[PDB]
Each structure stands twice: as structure tokens, then as C-alpha cells.
Amino acid sequence: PSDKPVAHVVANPQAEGQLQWLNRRANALLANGVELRDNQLVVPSEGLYLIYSQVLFKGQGCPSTHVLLTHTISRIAVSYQTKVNLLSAIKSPCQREKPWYEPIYLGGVFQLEKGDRLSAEINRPDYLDFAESGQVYFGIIAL
Amino acid sequence: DKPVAHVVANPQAEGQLQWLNRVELRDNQLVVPSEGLYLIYSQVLFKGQGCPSTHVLLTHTISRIAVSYQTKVNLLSAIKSPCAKPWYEPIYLGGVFQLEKGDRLSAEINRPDYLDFAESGQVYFGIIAL
Amino acid sequence: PSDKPVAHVVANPQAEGQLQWLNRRANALLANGVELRDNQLVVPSEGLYLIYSQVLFKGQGCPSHVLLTHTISRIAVTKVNLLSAIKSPCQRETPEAKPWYEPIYLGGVFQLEKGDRLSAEINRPDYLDFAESGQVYFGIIAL
Numbered sequence: 001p002s003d004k005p006v007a008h009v010v011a012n013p014q015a016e017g018q019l020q021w022l023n024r025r026a027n028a029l030l031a032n033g034v035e036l037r038d039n040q041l042v043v044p045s046e047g048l049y050l051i052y053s054q055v056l057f058k059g060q061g062c063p064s065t066h067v068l069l070t071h072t073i074s075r076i077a078v079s080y081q082t083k084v085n086l087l088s089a090i091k092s093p094c095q096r097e098k099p100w101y102e103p104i105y106l107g108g109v110f111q112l113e114k115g116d117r118l119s120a121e122i123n124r125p126d127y128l129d130f131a132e133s134g135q136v137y138f139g140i141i142a143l
Numbered sequence: 144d145k146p147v148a149h150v151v152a153n154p155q156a157e158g159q160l161q162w163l164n165r166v167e168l169r170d171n172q173l174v175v176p177s178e179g180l181y182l183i184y185s186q187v188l189f190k191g192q193g194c195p196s197t198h199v200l201l202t203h204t205i206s207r208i209a210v211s212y213q214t215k216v217n218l219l220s221a222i223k224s225p226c227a228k229p230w231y232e233p234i235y236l237g238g239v240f241q242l243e244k245g246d247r248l249s250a251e252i253n254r255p256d257y258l259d260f261a262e263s264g265q266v267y268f269g270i271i272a273l
Numbered sequence: 274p275s276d277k278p279v280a281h282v283v284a285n286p287q288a289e290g291q292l293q294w295l296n297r298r299a300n301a302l303l304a305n306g307v308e309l310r311d312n313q314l315v316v317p318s319e320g321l322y323l324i325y326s327q328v329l330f331k332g333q334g335c336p337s338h339v340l341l342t343h344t345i346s347r348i349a350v351t352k353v354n355l356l357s358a359i360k361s362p363c364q365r366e367t368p369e370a371k372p373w374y375e376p377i378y379l380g381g382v383f384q385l386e387k388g389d390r391l392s393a394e395i396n397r398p399d400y401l402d403f404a405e406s407g408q409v410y411f412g413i414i415a416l
């Protein structure tokens with residue numbers, strides 16, 4: 001077996017106007033020290049980690065406004081109070097004004113320390129999509 | 144020491160997403176050889192000559208067929224809407240999953256008619272035991 | 274633990290009119306042999322690597338034919354193009370200039386040799402976006 005800290009949390013299809021992460025679901029886990037505290041993954045030990053996250057946005061008809069969709073994975077060091085962007089993307093789904101779909105996939109390898117908190121956050125949770133399993137997730141893998 | 148797999152799409156097998164190896168590849172699916180944590184990853188590239196009048200949806204999904212629960216369950220999935228000039232749309236999936244010995248894994252798309260076999264190093268699917 | 278070569282370099286927000294990669298920054302790294310020489314990642318050993326890169330373009334409106342390119346190339350010790358994308362953000366010209374956003378992600382698995390130099394390059398660095406960290410990056414992961 002592997003003693004490697006790993007985590008794969010999935011979005012709750014019933015957290016009104018927010019992106020709430022869960023481990024107590026099928027095909028989602030927290031293992032070898034990784035904790036999910038206040039919607040954030042707590043790094044159990046210093047090392048290199050693969051951080052990833054995907055969100056799927058969907059909008060029934062192109063809204064009557066230019067819409068900005070952001071997805072950001074942040075790092076809050078043990079002492080820090082707020083985010084420090086690790087990976088971030090911003091997409092404009094609506095050029096003009098049929099349902100649109102926009103997935104955002106962030107991933108990279110980062111050096112993390114003992115007790116750092118990682119958060120995957122979006123600006124528009126009103127456009128999230130949970131109509132199918134495995135479309136919205138956040139995870140980490142120690143190398 | 145640790146089971147690994149990296150299969151690529153067959154360019155010469157047009158109209159379907161068929162995987163080719165260099166873990167077993169049985170009936171277009173990766174068979175997990177032992178219980179453990181695995182990194183599952185995949186990428187597909189779509190391409191189309193302009194936009195048709197009938198709306199289009201492009202999906203890519205990695206599924207699991209558990210040794211107790213014989214039904215396909217979604218592990219990772221994404222959906223993109225690409226719509227007289229051509230377009231290109233990649234979809235990439237990856238995550239860490241606890242798998243059991245004998246689990247079948249299948250990366251699948253809905254529209255193989257829009258696949259881009261032209262990009263070799265871009266249509267792939269693999270697993271890495273941690 | 275992991276002896277596998279990994280790299281995650283980020284664009285310098287200060288560097289005007291160019292896409293300059295940095296490792297000497299917080300939440301950016303070079304590990305297990307990967308070097309950053311003359312804006313290029315030097316592959317330390319033969320093997321299969323995941324090559325990933327993201328750039329974010331932003332422009333204040335659509336004036337009267339923009340082409341935005343992003344390309345990853347390998348220079349052997351034999352110059353080759355690995356991944357490339359070209360986007361036209363203004364597929365309609367604003368006749369109130371609303372800002373457009375165009376992210377380009379390139380990624381693939383490639384067999385590389387020891388001493389290969391990898392470069393992630395764009396044609397229009399005047400449209401780059403440095404409003405927040407984590408938006409522009411280039412990295413490799415040995416498999």
C-alpha cells in the first residue's frame with residue numbers, strides 16, 4: 001500500500017450558490033493525512049504535490065451580458081490569512097446573444113509545507129453544473 | 144514495481160476512439176491489476192470545419208466498472224460547446240482514485256466524428272499506481 | 274521521495290513586451306534536474322514527459338484581425354514544434370469596448386531526450402494578462 005498523502009474531493013450538488021467540497025461520497029477520498037477543514041485541503045507534510053481541479057460551467061442561453069467565469073486554486077501558508085494564487089483561469093463564454101458549456105481545468109506541481117490550506121474557488125457558482133457525476137472536483141497527490 | 148499505462152488513439156482507425164498500448168488493455172478499457180491509488184489521466188482533441196446549424200456538444204468521460212458494482216460510474220467528465228472558419232477544442236481529465244483489482248476503466252467521447260487524429264502527442268489515456 | 278524531474282515556471286509580470294519564465298519566485302519550481310536556461314526548460318534525462326502550458330490573453334474591445342498564437346517547441350542536441358494553437362478573439366468587431374479574454378492551454382505527453390530545450394512562446398505579449406498570479410505558466414512532469 002501507499003503512505004503518500006492524496007486527496008480527491010467532489011462538489012456537493014446541493015450547496016446553494018457555492019462550491020462546497022466533499023470526501024464522504026463514492027469515488028472521492030482523503031488519505032494518509034490530508035484533511036478537509038473549512039472547505040480547504042490541509043497539507044499534512046512538506047513536499048511536492050500535484051494540485052488539480054476542474055469545474056464545469058453551463059448557461060442555458062447566452063445571457064444578456066458579457067459574463068466572466070473564473071476558477072482559482074489558492075494556497076494559504078500555515079500563518080497566512082488569505083489566498084496566494086497557484087493556478088487561475090478566466091473564460092468569457094458569451095461573445096454575443098442554445099445552452100453553452102465551459103469547463104475549466106487547472107493543474108500543476110507545487111512545493112507545499114506542513115499545515116498549508118488549499119482552496120479551489122469560482123466566482124459564479126450560479127453557473128455550476130452537477131447534472132452528471134465527476135464534473136466538479138479538486139485533489140492533491142504528494143510525489 | 145508499480146503498474147503504469149499510457150495508451151494513445153489509433154490515427155488509422157477513423158470514426159471511433161480506439162486505444163493502442165506500447166495493466167492490461169482489454170476491449171478498449173484499462174484493467175487495474177491490483178488494489179491501490181491510481182492517477183487517472185486523459186486528453187482528447189476535437190476539430191470541426193466551421194459551425195453546423197444543429198447545436199453541438201462535445202463530451203469526454205473516464206468511467207469505472209467496479210468489481211462489486213458492475214455498472215459504469217463517471218470518475219471524471221467534461222462537456223464543451225465549440226459553437227465559415229474551422230475550430231479546435233481540447234478536453235483534459237485527471238484525478239487520483241482508489242481502485243480495486245480487476246476494475247475496468249474507459250475514456251470515452253460522444254462525437255468521434257470530430258476527433259483530430261492529426262495531433263499524435265495529444266489524444267491519450269493512462270494510469271499510474273502511486 | 275520522488276526522484277522524477279518536474280518543473281513549474283511562471284511568467285514575470287514586470288517583464289514588458291515579452292513572456293519571460295521564472296523559477297526564482299514563490300509557488301514556482303525546478304526539481305530533480307530540470308534547469309531554466311535562456312527562457313527554456315532543459316530536460317535532464319531521457320523519458321516520457323507531460324508538457325503543459327497556459328497563457329491568458331486580454332484585450333479592451335474588438336477594433337478593426339487579431340491573431341493570437343501559443344506554441345511549445347523542442348530543440349534537440351533538430352528544432353521541432355510540439356503543440357501549437359492559434360486563436361482569433363475578435364470574430365465580430367465592436368461598432369462601448371467590452372474586454373475580451375482568451376486563455377490558451379497546450380498539453381501533451383512527449384518522449385524527450387537528455388539535454389532537450391523546451392520553449393513556450395506567444396506572438397503577442399502586448400495582450401498578456403498579469404492581473405493575478407497563476408494565470409500564465411509552463412511546466413513539465415516526468416512519467
Ligand SMILES: O=C1NC[C@@H]2CN(c3ncc(-c4ccc5nc6n(c5n4)[C@@H]4CN(Cc5ccccc54)C6)cn3)CCN12
Pocket residue numbers: 050052105106107108109141142143182184185186235236237271272273275323325380382414415416
Ligand atoms: O505521486 C506520483 N508518482 C508517480 C506520479 C507521476 N505524476 C504524474 N504523472 C503523470 C501526470 C500526467 C500525465 C499526463 C496528463 N494529461 C493530463 N494530465 C496529466 N497528468 C492532467 C490533467 N490534464 C492537464 C494537466 C496539466 C497539468 C498537470 C496535470 C494534468 C491532462 C501527472 N502527474 C506525479 C504524481 N505521481
